[PDB]
Amino acid sequence: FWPQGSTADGNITQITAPLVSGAPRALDISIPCSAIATLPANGGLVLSTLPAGGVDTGKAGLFVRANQDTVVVAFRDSVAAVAARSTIAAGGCSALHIWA
């Protein structure tokens, strides 16, 4: 489960768990929109299952990138849930729900 840490002032921490078989069996994720409405301008990496610095981590993992004007929920380089960023930070949505 996650968040399982805290680093001494709220601030849930990342974790590392390199799975041997690659993909998991189930991936119920959830993110509130009061948490996506707090990124700065140009946003960046709301959540991920791989670090964005590795070798070809785009076509392997899951990336929720909040760029300017949009929040794109990709997959193995296959967009699933583009959503505008002016209705997220307005009370238009409730929670981003991912499942695999």
Which residue number, 70 or 93, has a Cβ lying nearer to other proteins? 70
Which residues would be at the binding site for other proteins (CB under 8 A)?
Answer: 58-59, 67, 74, 77-79, 82
Alpha helix (H) residue ranges in the chain? 33-36
d(CA 76, CA 68): 21
CB of 58 to other proteins, least distance (A): 7
- Residues ≥6 apart with Cβ < 8 Å to 1: none
Q: Quick one: 3 or 46, whose CB is closer to other proteins?
A: 46
Cα–Cα distance measured from residue 37 to residue 93, given in angstroms and rounded to the nearest whole number: 11
Q: Least CB distance from residue 72 to other proteins, whole Å?
A: 8
Task: Kindly state the smallest distance separating residue 67's Cβ from other proteins, in Å.
Answer: 7
